[PDB]
Write a protein that binds this ligand. Structure first.
Ligand code: FAD
Ligand code: SF4
Ligand code: SF4
Ligand code: SF4
Ligand code: SF4
Ligand code: SF4
Ligand code: FES
Lengths: 549, 411, 137
């Protein structure tokens, strides 16, 4: 057939979204090659990207559906397994309404599968009990940055920090995780850019920094409060910015004026505090790289120094999962439909109803991952898990196992036989990133294409196909979407932003950044261009008091 | 026609001759070899996307080489290591491969180390005056040329300037001016001196073609009997036209080659003294190499690194988990590669941490060369440590005029 | 506070014999060099020398048989070529190449072994502490 064919794809291992070539010989992925054309990484990959191809053709991959029949799983046909799932979901619905079910997907999955998953969870039985890894993962920082600015995403890109004078890494292992985001720090120091690292431990990304600052762990609020106190005290705040685009300054004033001497809390001497504070406030264009109160303090700093809406500046919280941003965008949260359209507002609730040809959408705040797992027997019973391994990921794994065994009809879709699989009643095999054909979304809001290299191992299918077949079994209208392009077009019709991100535009190696409202718009690589995304269009900066644990 | 002839060559097929960068002779020769069954496949470069994307391609259908026609100056890749990894080193199948000077040198390095079969491989070599990274070319065009890069149709380095053809007209800027401003050819391409691959089987270029054929003929130099046979077969079956080259063309070809040698020497100088001398060079090297995150891209991309397991992976040399890795990591590559480095730049350009691997390695290589007199990538000469000789060892000890190896070795 | 750390890698058949003969003849020299004793100097890999220098050897000495007197017919020609190349690498990484030398000591040259010991110690003392130990940090 084919000998050494190159297929361009996105790396599935973190939020940088590096591009790579998979080498496919006789329908087998046999290696990973650089793609020098990519703007994100210029053909450069970390160890994970270099060896992403190893797990694709493992013998352990699930090949056919499995059904727990009075013990060890026996081999089932697709029709059999799907009819079983449809029957059990139907009965649990008809007995316990929409509260009885529970959905959660992984951030490993492509945008089209996250969107169709949340569409399945809402168009059919109307439940907002949909969620994903981002809860239990490191950062609920999206909510905090949303409160500060309006969009919880990173304000600027990665190439953007090359334009600053004062990259300020803060508590980030940006070279251990996101190494090709830390490549920007390496390039910047080669260009001679002031770099200040502030992690509690001397990490390999703190080696690159001109100044390194220890502080006692769990004291970010105290340290940032001190820095803002000195900025206010010597008046290096940005008056036009604060008076024009920011609100809450008096509250910040009261809250911070109690942090003149905080050496007791954080270990940093007042001399070093003044040094970093004045370097940051004096830098004309300074970018913060972060990795709830902790992220709102960063928003406080950026708003206080007027470092937001411009090239070479901003706040860039690093995500960590390959498609966590994409899942949140597609609307795999309890409270947002898609593109962060809140379900609390009847306006877009009715817009969803009209677009999806369904009625009486829930509008109540769903149950997050831990909410579901804790109430996994009390009112929730019946659970579809799209790619999670909760027994290995959640803390108190034994409690997780107890709750899952308290559960009626778990369904698990995975590419491998995990530990959570033993507790499933049905196991639907899935496809990995080399067999899907969707899109990922980087941490810098960039939509990248994933391309099909090989076929799923045996009888395994990809998630859009599985969910469409299940919805056709259960009699649900609106899941007639045979391709990732059709799923994407349905999503685009639904969402106001991302309406310009057609696949003919995503076939560009550059990709598209998420606020792309029209088809001629080139994208929005820098957010909050001259107005924010809150009610008055003005960022709010809050006063946080440090709580000792 | 016989191993040393210098010819003008263009394709009989008008479409092949249009799509060739010059006369289409590389694409006519490759097509002929494929369809007359000298070779079982053809490894060439095609555009996968915009002309800034160069994708290697194994082609077995003779109908697909018209897609390979044209030269991509943003193709900074290296072919021979892909043939060893995913084509079993050409141990069972004949191939015909289009290659630049660095790609010919890499072929010879891997054949020295027994990793490919040059009896099976046919190397059609192209002249190379330099390659540009695709993304750097984009930034060049956006900033210095003041053009939207997606507008460009074709783009080439001709007469030492960067001609781009966009909608509206064409432009040109001296590559030396660009290279001073911080753009241009890759660093190793600036230092390169393998301009006409005379170690390949055929050397094709646009240098020395003068007069009525200045854009519709390829200057061919027949560098081996295998290439002579390929050319004679193509000319007889009528896929290729041959006229003897013009002596004035040969002369100015020699002059341009010599000038490119001098420019390469100048860049070698300014770069190697830019690295420093004494303990300053050790702080440059050590502080740069402290960035390495052990992605091993430099090892996997180097043509000379053919080892099943690198010694950089052995726990008695490098501690497995310590990430701010030792200088031993790069000392083990200086020791193993620097004697034969072909200055391909792959190690430098695939490094996520932007470490000047190629600059360090070539700075060591140039004077290992002027010490032992071994030029990498030219022929089947074994590596310096794979062939030690009694008389030569006596000679270097006597030349030091000393009873040991301590001093009077360098000037 | 500082004592030179010199490491020697001496072959078994001429340099170890020469050092043993010097000891037997009671030739005194300073106690600064510690030896490793491989069979031939052909065994000495480049990575041994580089590993020593990166661990912090202020000096490295490799001692073997005279040319034409290797126990294994030609194993010290290979070592000589390797050490010439090592001298070149250390000069181009900016470390002082006179921290390394290769001496040819026969089995009967105990006096010459003592003189080699003295001269290596003197040269390293002049050179001073190696820079790697502070460049690491
Ligand atoms: C990056 C680059 C720089 C060059 N610089 C010069 C120069 O300064 N002076 C000069 O006289 N000639 C240069 N050449 C060669 C020049 O294009 C030749 O005149 C041309 O190859 C003649 O062949 P043709 O037009 O007859 O056949 P063509 O139809 O052009 O055949 C060209 C062949 O080269 C292959 N190819 C294309 N891009 C690459 C690449 N990046 N790496 C390897 N193979 C590739 C194509 O697949 C095709 O088989 C350069 C070539 C490249 C690729
Ligand atoms: S930096 Fe992240 S996305 Fe890029 S190759 Fe490494 S793990 Fe994959
Ligand atoms: S290294 Fe030399 S031969 Fe290779 S592309 Fe650069 S200039 Fe051409
Ligand atoms: S490519 Fe660069 S980062 Fe990767 S191992 Fe080599 S030197 Fe280190
Ligand atoms: S060390 Fe780097 S420049 Fe030298 S041959 Fe290997 S890849 Fe090419
Ligand atoms: S560095 Fe040395 S051991 Fe490692 S792959 Fe290259 S040649 Fe082999
Ligand atoms: S036996 Fe001593 S050098 Fe070989």
């Amino acid at each position: 057939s084919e000998i050494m064919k190159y297929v361009a794809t996105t790396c599935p291992y973190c939020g940088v979204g590096c591009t790579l070539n998979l080498v496919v010989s006789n329908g087998k992925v046999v290696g990973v090659e650089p793609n020098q054309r990519s703007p994100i990484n210029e053909g450069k990959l970390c160890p994970k990207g270099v060896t992403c191809w190893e797990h694709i053709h493992s013998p352990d991959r699930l090949t056919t559906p499995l059904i727990k029949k009075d013990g060890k799983f026996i081999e089932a046909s697709w029709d059999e397994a799907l009819d079983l799932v449809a029957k059990n979901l139907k009965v649990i619905y008809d007995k316990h309404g929409p509260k009885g079910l529970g959905f959660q997907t992984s951030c490993r999955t492509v945008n089209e599968d996250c969107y169709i998953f949340q569409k399945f969870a809402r168009v059919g039985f109307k439940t907002n009990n949909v969620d994903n890894c981002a809860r239990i993962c490191h950062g609920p920082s999206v909510a905090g940055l949303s409160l500060s600015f309006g969009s919880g995403a990173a304000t600027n890109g990665f190439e953007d920090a090359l334009n600053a004078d004062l990259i300020l890494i803060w508590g980030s292992n940006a070279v251990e995780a996101h190494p090709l985001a830390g490549r920007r720090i390496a390039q910047a120091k080669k260009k001679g850019i002031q770099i200040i690292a502030v992690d509690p431990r001397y990490t390999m990304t703190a080696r690159l920094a001109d100044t390194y600052v220890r502080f006692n762990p769990s004291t970010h609020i105290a340290l940032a409060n001190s820095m803002m106190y000195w900025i206010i005290k010597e008046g290096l705040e940005d008056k036009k910015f604060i008076q024009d685009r920011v609100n809450g300054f008096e509250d910040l004033k009261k809250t911070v004026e109690n942090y003149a001497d905080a050496e007791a809390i954080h270990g940093v001497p007042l001399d070093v505090v003044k040094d970093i504070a004045f370097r940051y406030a004096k830098a004309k264009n300074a970018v913060i790289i972060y990795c709830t109160d902790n992220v709102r303090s960063m928003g406080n700093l950026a708003l206080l120094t007027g470092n937001v809406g411009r090239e070479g500046v901003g706040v860039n919280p690093l995500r960590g999962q390959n498609n966590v941003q994409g899942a949140c965008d597609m609307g795999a949260y309890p409270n947002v439909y898609s593109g962060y359209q809140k379900c609390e507002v009847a306006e877009n609730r009715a817009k969803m109803e009209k677009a999806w040809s369904v009625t009486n959408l829930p509008d109540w705040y769903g149950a997050t991952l831990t909410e579901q797992i804790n109430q996994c027997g009390d009112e929730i019973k019946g659970m579809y898990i799209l790619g999670l391994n909760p027994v290995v990921t959640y803390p108190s794994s034994n409690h997780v196992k107890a709750q899952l065994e308290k559960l009626d009809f778990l369904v698990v879709q995975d590419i491998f036989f995990t530990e959570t699989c033993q507790y499933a009643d049905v196991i639907l095999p899935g496809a990995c990133f080399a067999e899907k054909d969707g899109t990922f979304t980087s941490g810098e809001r960039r939509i990248n294409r994933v391309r099909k290299a090989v076929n799923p191992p045996g009888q395994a299918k990809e998630d859009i196909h599985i969910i469409s077949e299940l919805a056709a079994k259960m009699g649900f209208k609106g899941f007639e979407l045979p391709t990732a392009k059709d799923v994407w077009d349905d999503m685009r019709a639904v969402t106001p932003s991302m309406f310009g991100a057609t696949y003919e535009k995503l076939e560009r190696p550059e990709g598209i950044c998420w606020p792309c409202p029209t088809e001629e718009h080139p994208g929005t690589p820098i957010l909050h261009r001259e107005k924010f995304a809150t009610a008055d269009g003005k960022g709010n900066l809050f006063g946080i008091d440090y709580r000792p644990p | 026609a016989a191993k040393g002839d210098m010819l003008y060559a263009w394709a009989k097929d008008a479409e092949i001759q249009k799509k060739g960068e010059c006369g289409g002779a590389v694409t006519a020769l490759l097509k002929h070899a494929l369809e007359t069954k000298m070779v079982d496949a053809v490894v060439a470069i095609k555009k996968g996307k915009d002309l800034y994307d160069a994708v290697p391609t194994v082609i077995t259908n003779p109908e697909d080489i018209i897609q390979t026609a044209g030269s991509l100056h943003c193709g900074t890749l290296l072919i021979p290591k892909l043939i060893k990894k995913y084509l079993n080193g050409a141990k069972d199948m004949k191939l015909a491969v289009t290659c630049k000077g660095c790609d010919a040198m890499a072929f010879y390095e891997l054949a020295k180390r027994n990793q490919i079969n040059l009896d099976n491989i046919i190397m059609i070599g192209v002249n190379c005056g330099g390659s540009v990274s695709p993304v750097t070319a984009r930034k060049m065009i956006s900033n210095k040329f003041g053009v939207d890069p997606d507008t460009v149709h074709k783009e080439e380095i001709d007469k030492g300037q960067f001609i781009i053809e966009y909608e509206g007209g064409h432009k040109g800027i001296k590559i030396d001016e660009l290279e001073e401003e911080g753009y241009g050819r890759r660093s190793n391409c600036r230092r390169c001196k393998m301009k006409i691959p005379r170690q390949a089987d055929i050397a094709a270029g646009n240098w020395g073609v003068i007069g009525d054929k200045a854009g519709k003929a390829t200057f061919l130099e027949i560098c081996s009997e295998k290439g002579a046979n390929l050319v004679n077969s193509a000319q007889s079956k009528g896929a290729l036209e041959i006229s003897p080259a013009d002596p004035k063309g040969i002369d100015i070809r020699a002059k341009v080659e010599k000038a490119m040698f001098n420019l390469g020497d100048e860049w070698r100088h300014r770069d190697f003294e830019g690295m420093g001398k004494g303990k300053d060079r050790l702080k440059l090297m050590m502080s740069e190499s402290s960035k390495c995150i052990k992605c091993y891209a430099c090892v996997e991309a180097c043509p000379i690194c053919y080892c099943i397991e690198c010694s950089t992976k052995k726990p008695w040399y490098i501690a497995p988990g310590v990430l701010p890795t030792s200088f031993m990591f790069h000392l083990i590559r200086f020791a193993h590669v620097s004697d034969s480095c072909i200055n391909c730049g792959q190690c430098e350009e695939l490094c996520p941490m932007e470490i000047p691997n190629a600059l360090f390695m070539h700075s060591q290589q140039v004077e290992i060369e002027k010490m032992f007199g071994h030029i990498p990538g030219q022929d089947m000469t074994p590596p310096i440590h794979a062939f030690v000789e009694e008389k030569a060892e006596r000679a270097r000890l006597d030349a030091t005029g000393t009873d040991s190896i301590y001093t009077n070795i360098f000037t | 506070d500082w004592k030179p750390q010199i490491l020697a890698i001496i072959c078994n058949w001429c340099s170890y014999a020469g050092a043993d003969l010097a000891g037997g003849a009671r030739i005194q020299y300073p106690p600064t060099v510690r030896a490793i004793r491989v069979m031939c100097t052909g065994r000495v890999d480049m990575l041994f020398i580089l590993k020593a220098f990166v661990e912090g050897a202020d000096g490295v000495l490799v001692s073997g048989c005279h040319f034409g007197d290797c126990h294994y017919l030609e194993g010290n020609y290979k070592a000589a070529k390797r050490m010439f190349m090592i001298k070149n690498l250390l000069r181009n990484i900016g470390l002082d190449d006179r921290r390394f030398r290769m001496t040819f000591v026969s089995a009967s040259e105990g006096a010459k072994w003592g003189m080699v010991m003295e001269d290596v110690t003197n040269t390293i003392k002049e050179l001073g502490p190696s820079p790697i130990k502070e460049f690491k940090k």
